[PDB]
Amino acid sequence: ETLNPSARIMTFYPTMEEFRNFSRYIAYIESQGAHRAGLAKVVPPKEWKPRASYDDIDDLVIPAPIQQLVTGQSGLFTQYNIQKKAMTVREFRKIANSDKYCTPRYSEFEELERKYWKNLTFNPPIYGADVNGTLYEKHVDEWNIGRLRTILDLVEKESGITIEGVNTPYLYFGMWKTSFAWHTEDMDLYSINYLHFGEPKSWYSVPPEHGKRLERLAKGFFPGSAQSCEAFLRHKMTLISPLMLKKYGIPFDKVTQEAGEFMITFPYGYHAGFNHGFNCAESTNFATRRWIEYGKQAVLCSCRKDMVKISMDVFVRKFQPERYKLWKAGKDNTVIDHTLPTPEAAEF
Ligand SMILES: O=C(O)CCC(=O)C(=O)O
Ligand code: NI
Ligand SMILES: [Zn+2]
Protein backbone atom coordinates (compact mmCIF):
# COMPACT_ATOMS: atom_id res chain seq x y z
CA GLU A 1 0.00 0.00 0.00
CA THR A 2 3.05 2.25 0.04
CA LEU A 3 3.63 3.09 -3.65
CA ASN A 4 1.43 5.85 -5.15
CA PRO A 5 -0.67 5.86 -1.95
CA SER A 6 -3.06 8.55 -3.20
CA ALA A 7 -3.66 6.29 -6.22
CA ARG A 8 -3.53 9.26 -8.59
CA ILE A 9 -2.88 8.95 -12.32
CA MET A 10 0.86 9.09 -12.98
CA THR A 11 2.79 10.37 -15.99
CA PHE A 12 6.16 9.03 -17.18
CA TYR A 13 8.81 10.30 -19.58
CA PRO A 14 11.06 7.38 -20.58
CA THR A 15 14.43 7.98 -22.23
CA MET A 16 14.98 6.34 -25.61
CA GLU A 17 16.99 3.57 -23.94
CA GLU A 18 14.26 2.85 -21.38
CA PHE A 19 11.65 3.05 -24.13
CA ARG A 20 13.03 0.18 -26.20
CA ASN A 21 11.90 -2.66 -23.92
CA PHE A 22 8.11 -2.45 -23.57
CA SER A 23 7.46 -5.21 -21.05
CA ARG A 24 10.33 -3.96 -18.89
CA TYR A 25 9.01 -0.41 -18.77
CA ILE A 26 5.55 -1.59 -17.76
CA ALA A 27 7.27 -3.46 -14.94
CA TYR A 28 8.99 -0.20 -14.04
CA ILE A 29 5.92 2.04 -13.85
CA GLU A 30 4.19 -0.63 -11.76
CA SER A 31 7.19 -0.49 -9.41
CA GLN A 32 6.30 3.20 -9.10
CA GLY A 33 2.71 2.32 -8.18
CA ALA A 34 1.16 3.49 -11.45
CA HIS A 35 -1.24 0.53 -11.61
CA ARG A 36 -3.09 1.66 -8.50
CA ALA A 37 -4.84 4.48 -10.41
CA GLY A 38 -5.97 2.01 -13.07
CA LEU A 39 -4.62 4.34 -15.73
CA ALA A 40 -1.22 5.86 -16.56
CA LYS A 41 0.22 8.21 -19.17
CA VAL A 42 3.47 7.58 -20.98
CA VAL A 43 5.04 10.35 -23.02
CA PRO A 44 7.45 8.91 -25.63
CA PRO A 45 10.91 10.35 -26.37
CA LYS A 46 10.92 13.49 -28.56
CA GLU A 47 13.05 11.53 -31.01
CA TRP A 48 10.50 8.70 -31.46
CA LYS A 49 7.79 8.65 -34.14
CA PRO A 50 5.44 5.82 -35.19
CA ARG A 51 4.93 7.18 -38.72
CA ALA A 52 6.58 9.90 -40.84
CA SER A 53 3.41 11.58 -42.14
CA TYR A 54 -0.36 11.21 -41.74
CA ASP A 55 -1.49 12.89 -44.96
CA ASP A 56 -1.68 9.60 -46.90
CA ILE A 57 -4.47 7.82 -45.01
CA ASP A 58 -7.17 9.97 -46.55
CA ASP A 59 -8.56 7.00 -48.50
CA LEU A 60 -8.52 4.63 -45.52
CA VAL A 61 -11.96 3.03 -45.19
CA ILE A 62 -13.99 3.08 -41.99
CA PRO A 63 -16.24 0.13 -42.80
CA ALA A 64 -18.73 0.50 -39.93
CA PRO A 65 -19.02 4.01 -38.44
CA ILE A 66 -21.31 4.19 -35.41
CA GLN A 67 -23.80 6.94 -34.59
CA GLN A 68 -23.89 7.16 -30.81
CA LEU A 69 -27.38 7.69 -29.43
CA VAL A 70 -27.49 8.43 -25.72
CA THR A 71 -30.54 8.38 -23.44
CA GLY A 72 -30.68 9.26 -19.76
CA GLN A 73 -30.80 11.89 -17.04
CA SER A 74 -29.27 12.88 -13.69
CA GLY A 75 -25.78 11.75 -14.69
CA LEU A 76 -26.86 8.21 -15.64
CA PHE A 77 -27.03 7.24 -19.32
CA THR A 78 -27.23 4.31 -21.74
CA GLN A 79 -25.60 4.48 -25.15
CA TYR A 80 -27.14 2.93 -28.27
CA ASN A 81 -25.15 2.27 -31.43
CA ILE A 82 -26.50 2.82 -34.92
CA GLN A 83 -24.28 1.46 -37.67
CA LYS A 84 -23.87 3.85 -40.59
CA LYS A 85 -22.71 3.13 -44.13
CA ALA A 86 -18.97 2.77 -44.77
CA MET A 87 -17.04 5.97 -45.33
CA THR A 88 -13.49 7.12 -45.91
CA VAL A 89 -11.28 9.04 -43.49
CA ARG A 90 -11.74 12.20 -45.67
CA GLU A 91 -15.49 11.95 -45.51
CA PHE A 92 -15.31 11.35 -41.76
CA ARG A 93 -13.00 14.32 -41.14
CA LYS A 94 -15.21 16.68 -43.14
CA ILE A 95 -18.27 15.64 -41.17
CA ALA A 96 -16.26 15.93 -37.94
CA ASN A 97 -15.02 19.44 -38.68
CA SER A 98 -18.38 20.59 -40.04
CA ASP A 99 -20.16 23.32 -38.08
CA LYS A 100 -22.81 20.79 -37.03
CA TYR A 101 -20.34 18.50 -35.25
CA CYS A 102 -17.18 20.50 -34.54
CA THR A 103 -15.82 21.24 -31.08
CA PRO A 104 -17.67 24.11 -29.38
CA ARG A 105 -15.62 27.13 -28.32
CA TYR A 106 -14.28 27.17 -24.77
CA SER A 107 -11.41 28.44 -22.63
CA GLU A 108 -10.41 25.71 -20.16
CA PHE A 109 -10.96 21.94 -20.08
CA GLU A 110 -13.47 22.11 -17.24
CA GLU A 111 -15.71 24.26 -19.43
CA LEU A 112 -15.52 21.74 -22.27
CA GLU A 113 -16.07 18.87 -19.83
CA ARG A 114 -19.23 20.57 -18.57
CA LYS A 115 -20.42 20.99 -22.16
CA TYR A 116 -19.90 17.29 -22.76
CA TRP A 117 -22.02 16.14 -19.81
CA LYS A 118 -24.69 18.78 -20.47
CA ASN A 119 -25.04 17.93 -24.18
CA LEU A 120 -24.29 14.21 -24.22
CA THR A 121 -27.83 13.26 -25.25
CA PHE A 122 -28.17 15.87 -28.02
CA ASN A 123 -26.85 15.85 -31.62
CA PRO A 124 -25.66 12.19 -31.71
CA PRO A 125 -22.06 12.07 -33.00
CA ILE A 126 -20.44 9.47 -35.26
CA TYR A 127 -17.53 7.34 -34.02
CA GLY A 128 -15.24 5.55 -36.46
CA ALA A 129 -14.46 2.91 -33.89
CA ASP A 130 -13.09 -0.64 -34.04
CA VAL A 131 -11.34 -0.25 -37.40
CA ASN A 132 -8.97 -3.16 -38.00
CA GLY A 133 -5.58 -1.69 -38.76
CA THR A 134 -2.37 0.05 -37.74
CA LEU A 135 -0.92 3.42 -38.66
CA TYR A 136 2.57 2.40 -37.55
CA GLU A 137 5.28 2.05 -40.17
CA LYS A 138 6.34 -1.60 -40.37
CA HIS A 139 9.91 -0.88 -39.21
CA VAL A 140 9.02 0.75 -35.87
CA ASP A 141 10.33 -1.59 -33.16
CA GLU A 142 9.55 0.46 -30.04
CA TRP A 143 6.04 0.27 -28.56
CA ASN A 144 4.55 -1.02 -31.79
CA ILE A 145 0.93 -1.71 -30.85
CA GLY A 146 0.85 -4.33 -33.61
CA ARG A 147 3.62 -6.39 -31.97
CA LEU A 148 4.16 -5.47 -28.31
CA ARG A 149 5.87 -8.77 -27.43
CA THR A 150 3.99 -9.72 -24.25
CA ILE A 151 2.84 -13.08 -22.91
CA LEU A 152 -0.64 -12.41 -24.34
CA ASP A 153 0.76 -13.71 -27.64
CA LEU A 154 0.55 -17.22 -26.17
CA VAL A 155 -3.07 -17.10 -27.32
CA GLU A 156 -2.07 -16.67 -30.97
CA LYS A 157 1.34 -18.33 -31.04
CA GLU A 158 0.62 -21.52 -29.10
CA SER A 159 -3.11 -22.03 -29.72
CA GLY A 160 -3.54 -20.21 -33.04
CA ILE A 161 -6.43 -17.94 -32.13
CA THR A 162 -6.76 -14.36 -33.36
CA ILE A 163 -9.06 -12.03 -31.43
CA GLU A 164 -9.69 -8.83 -33.32
CA GLY A 165 -8.95 -5.74 -31.20
CA VAL A 166 -7.44 -7.89 -28.44
CA ASN A 167 -4.23 -9.27 -29.94
CA THR A 168 -4.65 -7.20 -33.10
CA PRO A 169 -4.73 -3.39 -33.32
CA TYR A 170 -7.84 -1.22 -33.59
CA LEU A 171 -8.12 2.31 -34.94
CA TYR A 172 -10.54 4.86 -33.47
CA PHE A 173 -11.47 7.94 -35.46
CA GLY A 174 -13.17 10.34 -33.08
CA MET A 175 -15.05 13.59 -33.26
CA TRP A 176 -16.44 15.94 -30.63
CA LYS A 177 -18.56 14.21 -27.98
CA THR A 178 -17.89 10.65 -29.17
CA SER A 179 -17.74 8.53 -26.02
CA PHE A 180 -16.41 5.34 -24.58
CA ALA A 181 -18.53 3.94 -21.77
CA TRP A 182 -17.36 2.58 -18.41
CA HIS A 183 -15.58 -0.75 -18.78
CA THR A 184 -12.62 -2.90 -17.91
CA GLU A 185 -10.90 -4.75 -20.77
CA ASP A 186 -12.07 -8.18 -21.87
CA MET A 187 -10.65 -10.83 -19.51
CA ASP A 188 -9.58 -7.81 -17.42
CA LEU A 189 -6.46 -7.39 -19.57
CA TYR A 190 -4.20 -4.35 -19.87
CA SER A 191 -4.82 -1.98 -22.73
CA ILE A 192 -2.53 0.46 -24.50
CA ASN A 193 -3.76 3.51 -26.39
CA TYR A 194 -1.75 5.80 -28.63
CA LEU A 195 -3.24 9.05 -29.92
CA HIS A 196 -1.78 9.42 -33.44
CA PHE A 197 -3.07 12.91 -34.23
CA GLY A 198 -5.86 15.41 -33.67
CA GLU A 199 -7.78 16.88 -30.74
CA PRO A 200 -7.33 15.39 -27.25
CA LYS A 201 -9.02 12.40 -25.66
CA SER A 202 -10.16 12.75 -22.03
CA TRP A 203 -10.26 9.85 -19.59
CA TYR A 204 -11.88 8.96 -16.30
CA SER A 205 -10.46 6.12 -14.21
CA VAL A 206 -11.40 4.22 -11.05
CA PRO A 207 -8.64 2.56 -8.99
CA PRO A 208 -8.85 -1.25 -9.33
CA GLU A 209 -8.92 -1.53 -5.52
CA HIS A 210 -12.27 0.29 -5.63
CA GLY A 211 -13.64 -1.17 -8.84
CA LYS A 212 -16.20 -3.29 -6.98
CA ARG A 213 -17.76 -0.12 -5.63
CA LEU A 214 -18.43 1.22 -9.11
CA GLU A 215 -20.04 -2.14 -9.97
CA ARG A 216 -22.39 -1.95 -6.98
CA LEU A 217 -23.34 1.58 -7.99
CA ALA A 218 -24.02 0.53 -11.58
CA LYS A 219 -26.05 -2.50 -10.51
CA GLY A 220 -28.13 -0.29 -8.23
CA PHE A 221 -28.84 2.24 -10.96
CA PHE A 222 -29.48 -0.19 -13.79
CA PRO A 223 -31.26 -3.02 -11.96
CA GLY A 224 -32.85 -4.29 -15.17
CA SER A 225 -29.52 -4.60 -16.92
CA ALA A 226 -27.99 -6.20 -13.89
CA GLN A 227 -30.60 -8.94 -13.94
CA SER A 228 -29.74 -9.90 -17.58
CA CYS A 229 -25.86 -10.23 -17.29
CA GLU A 230 -23.99 -10.13 -14.06
CA ALA A 231 -21.35 -8.31 -16.14
CA PHE A 232 -23.54 -5.88 -18.10
CA LEU A 233 -20.88 -3.16 -17.97
CA ARG A 234 -18.95 -5.25 -20.50
CA HIS A 235 -21.63 -4.29 -23.04
CA LYS A 236 -19.88 -0.92 -22.96
CA MET A 237 -23.16 1.02 -23.08
CA THR A 238 -23.13 2.55 -19.61
CA LEU A 239 -22.21 6.21 -19.02
CA ILE A 240 -21.96 7.72 -15.54
CA SER A 241 -21.03 11.34 -14.86
CA PRO A 242 -18.20 12.28 -12.46
CA LEU A 243 -20.81 14.19 -10.45
CA MET A 244 -22.58 10.89 -9.76
CA LEU A 245 -19.34 9.14 -8.83
CA LYS A 246 -18.53 11.95 -6.43
CA LYS A 247 -22.04 11.90 -4.97
CA TYR A 248 -21.74 8.21 -4.12
CA GLY A 249 -18.16 8.28 -2.88
CA ILE A 250 -16.52 6.41 -5.74
CA PRO A 251 -12.90 7.55 -5.98
CA PHE A 252 -11.73 8.43 -9.48
CA ASP A 253 -9.21 10.55 -11.34
CA LYS A 254 -9.25 12.45 -14.65
CA VAL A 255 -6.58 12.93 -17.28
CA THR A 256 -6.40 14.37 -20.77
CA GLN A 257 -4.42 12.52 -23.44
CA GLU A 258 -2.77 14.70 -26.08
CA ALA A 259 -1.61 13.74 -29.58
CA GLY A 260 1.59 11.69 -29.50
CA GLU A 261 0.92 10.32 -26.00
CA PHE A 262 0.27 6.79 -24.69
CA MET A 263 -2.33 5.78 -22.15
CA ILE A 264 -2.01 2.46 -20.33
CA THR A 265 -4.97 0.89 -18.55
CA PHE A 266 -4.36 -1.77 -15.94
CA PRO A 267 -6.20 -5.01 -15.10
CA TYR A 268 -9.63 -4.32 -13.63
CA GLY A 269 -9.19 -0.56 -14.01
CA TYR A 270 -12.57 0.89 -14.96
CA HIS A 271 -12.31 3.73 -17.44
CA ALA A 272 -14.49 5.93 -19.60
CA GLY A 273 -14.04 9.11 -21.60
CA PHE A 274 -14.76 11.24 -24.64
CA ASN A 275 -13.02 12.85 -27.63
CA HIS A 276 -12.53 16.63 -27.89
CA GLY A 277 -12.74 16.69 -31.68
CA PHE A 278 -11.40 15.01 -34.81
CA ASN A 279 -8.64 12.60 -33.83
CA CYS A 280 -7.28 9.13 -34.37
CA ALA A 281 -6.20 6.62 -31.75
CA GLU A 282 -4.78 3.12 -31.96
CA SER A 283 -5.42 0.48 -29.30
CA THR A 284 -4.90 -3.17 -28.32
CA ASN A 285 -4.66 -5.37 -25.23
CA PHE A 286 -1.60 -6.92 -23.62
CA ALA A 287 -0.66 -8.90 -20.53
CA THR A 288 1.97 -9.34 -17.84
CA ARG A 289 2.48 -12.22 -15.40
CA ARG A 290 0.37 -10.25 -12.90
CA TRP A 291 -2.61 -10.38 -15.27
CA ILE A 292 -2.94 -14.18 -15.19
CA GLU A 293 -4.68 -14.17 -11.83
CA TYR A 294 -7.10 -11.46 -13.04
CA GLY A 295 -7.85 -13.48 -16.16
CA LYS A 296 -8.71 -16.50 -14.05
CA GLN A 297 -11.23 -14.59 -11.91
CA ALA A 298 -12.62 -12.25 -14.59
CA VAL A 299 -16.42 -12.15 -14.48
CA LEU A 300 -17.71 -12.48 -18.03
CA CYS A 301 -20.81 -11.43 -19.94
CA SER A 302 -23.35 -14.27 -19.79
CA CYS A 303 -26.13 -12.92 -22.02
CA ARG A 304 -24.58 -13.06 -25.46
CA LYS A 305 -22.22 -15.91 -26.28
CA ASP A 306 -20.04 -14.23 -29.00
CA MET A 307 -18.29 -12.23 -26.34
CA VAL A 308 -14.51 -12.28 -26.08
CA LYS A 309 -13.47 -15.27 -23.99
CA ILE A 310 -9.89 -16.49 -23.56
CA SER A 311 -8.99 -19.93 -22.23
CA MET A 312 -6.70 -19.43 -19.21
CA ASP A 313 -5.52 -23.02 -19.40
CA VAL A 314 -2.32 -22.39 -21.36
CA PHE A 315 -1.36 -19.53 -19.01
CA VAL A 316 -1.87 -21.48 -15.78
CA ARG A 317 -0.04 -24.50 -17.19
CA LYS A 318 2.97 -22.44 -18.27
CA PHE A 319 3.30 -19.84 -15.49
CA GLN A 320 1.58 -21.52 -12.54
CA PRO A 321 2.37 -25.23 -12.99
CA GLU A 322 2.22 -25.85 -9.24
CA ARG A 323 -1.42 -24.74 -8.96
CA TYR A 324 -2.64 -26.07 -12.32
CA LYS A 325 -4.06 -29.30 -10.91
CA LEU A 326 -5.81 -27.39 -8.12
CA TRP A 327 -7.21 -24.82 -10.53
CA LYS A 328 -8.55 -27.44 -12.97
CA ALA A 329 -10.53 -28.91 -10.08
CA GLY A 330 -11.81 -25.44 -9.22
CA LYS A 331 -10.16 -25.35 -5.81
CA ASP A 332 -7.93 -22.34 -6.53
CA ASN A 333 -9.20 -19.68 -4.13
CA THR A 334 -6.42 -17.10 -4.53
CA VAL A 335 -7.23 -13.52 -3.48
CA ILE A 336 -5.89 -10.66 -5.62
CA ASP A 337 -4.03 -7.74 -4.00
CA HIS A 338 -4.57 -4.84 -6.42
CA THR A 339 -1.73 -2.82 -4.89
CA LEU A 340 0.92 -5.42 -5.71
CA PRO A 341 3.15 -4.73 -8.74
CA THR A 342 3.88 -7.40 -11.35
CA PRO A 343 6.69 -9.82 -10.35
CA GLU A 344 8.82 -8.52 -13.21
CA ALA A 345 9.14 -5.36 -11.17
CA ALA A 346 11.39 -6.96 -8.57
CA GLU A 347 14.55 -5.73 -10.23
CA PHE A 348 13.41 -2.21 -9.64
O1 LIG B 1 -10.55 5.71 -27.38
C2 LIG B 1 -11.47 4.91 -27.06
O3 LIG B 1 -12.50 4.81 -27.78
C4 LIG B 1 -11.36 4.06 -25.81
C5 LIG B 1 -10.10 3.24 -25.81
C6 LIG B 1 -10.08 2.30 -24.62
O7 LIG B 1 -11.07 2.06 -23.97
C8 LIG B 1 -8.76 1.66 -24.26
O9 LIG B 1 -7.74 1.98 -24.93
O10 LIG B 1 -8.71 0.84 -23.31
NI1 NI C 1 -10.67 0.27 -22.68
ZN1 LIG D 1 -23.98 -9.57 -21.17
Residue spans per domain, the chain: 9-348
Q: Is the separation of the CB atoms in 38 and 183 below 8 Å?
A: no
Distance in angstroms (rounded) separating the CA atoms of residues 268 and 298: 9
Query: Closest by alpha carbon to 252, among 65, 86, 36?
Result: 36
For residue 242, CA distances in Å to 76, 107, 175, 203, 239 come to 10, 20, 21, 11, 10
Q: Is 179 in the pocket of ligand 1 (CB under 6 A)?
A: no
DSSP secondary structure of 191-216: EEEEEEEES-EEEEEE-GGGHHHHHH
Q: What share of the chain is helix, strand, coil (3-state, %, to 5)?
A: 30, 25, 45
**CATH, range 9-348:** 2.60.120.650
Between the CA of 235 and the centroid of ligand 3 the distance, in Å, is: 6
- Whether 88 and 257 have beta carbons less than 8 Å apart is answered as no
Whether ligand 1 lies within 6 angstroms of the CB of 281 is answered as yes
The data reach a resolution, in angstroms, of 2.1
* Pocket residue to mutate for ligand 1, from 39, 68, 172, 203, most atoms within 8 A of Cβ: 172
- Looking only at the bridges linking them, the beta strands covering 39-42 and 10-12 are parallel
* Closest-approaching ligand to the CA atom of 172: 1
Number of residues that this document lists for the chain: 348
Please, are residues 30 and 341 in contact by the beta-carbon 8 Å criterion? Answer: yes
